[PDB]
Amino acid sequence: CEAPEGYILDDGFICTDIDE
Numbered sequence: 001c002e003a004p005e006g007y008i009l010d011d012g013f014i015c016t017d018i019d020e
Contacts, residue, residue, distance in 0.1 A: 001015030009017040 001013070003009060003013045003017070007013075007018055011017075
């Protein structure tokens with residue numbers, strides 16, 4: 001999964017984190 005504009009996880013990202 002990818003993180004779009006506004007989306008950003010410091011862990012490295014996986015799939016959905018801030019807008020779950």
